[PDB]
Amino acid sequence: ALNSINTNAGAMIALQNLNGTNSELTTVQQRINTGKKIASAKDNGAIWATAKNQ
Amino acid sequence: ALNSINTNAGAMIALQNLNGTNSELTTVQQRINTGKKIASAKDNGAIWATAKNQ
């Protein structure tokens, strides 16, 4: 309503973008800790299985 | 990956060439200790057998 005192979409959208950035930071920190792109089976299943077998 | 922290091919290839040189040194030192090219039956079987019989 642009004057509503019960809600505001700006805060929700700002929250969503902040959480997106936090998830990206999680991924990069994982990449740094392990030293490789595909560490677990969640990153990429096909390539992970291939590397294990190889 | 040229920045991988888990592996590097340069070290492996350097190792392989170093081991090749070490094997060559083994052969030359054998040649010096015994005083002859074909000492054992591993050097050359045909010529070694010929020399024994002769």
Side-chain angles (χ1 to χ4, degrees):
Chain A
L2 283 74
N3 285 100
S4 87
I5 193 66
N6 304 277
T7 191
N8 55 332
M12 311 171 148
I13 304 170
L15 271 163
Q16 295 167 7
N17 295 108
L18 172 55
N19 292 332
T21 59
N22 295 351
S23 72
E24 205 157 359
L25 263 180
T26 299
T27 292
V28 65
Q29 271 175 14
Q30 265 187 358
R31 192 94 52 95
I32 301 299
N33 298 320
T34 294
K36 34 172 71 173
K37 328 185 188 81
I38 297 89
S40 43
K42 293 186 286 185
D43 297 17
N44 214 17
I47 302 179
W48 179 82
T50 311
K52 269 293 182 304
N53 290 253
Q54 206 63 74
Chain B
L2 283 74
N3 285 280
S4 88
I5 193 66
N6 304 278
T7 191
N8 55 332
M12 311 171 148
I13 304 170
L15 271 163
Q16 295 167 7
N17 295 108
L18 172 55
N19 292 332
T21 59
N22 295 351
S23 72
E24 205 157 359
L25 263 180
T26 299
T27 292
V28 65
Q29 271 175 14
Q30 265 187 358
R31 192 94 52 95
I32 301 299
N33 298 320
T34 294
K36 34 172 71 173
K37 328 185 188 81
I38 297 89
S40 43
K42 293 186 286 185
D43 297 17
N44 214 17
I47 302 179
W48 179 82
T50 311
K52 269 293 182 304
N53 290 253
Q54 206 63 74

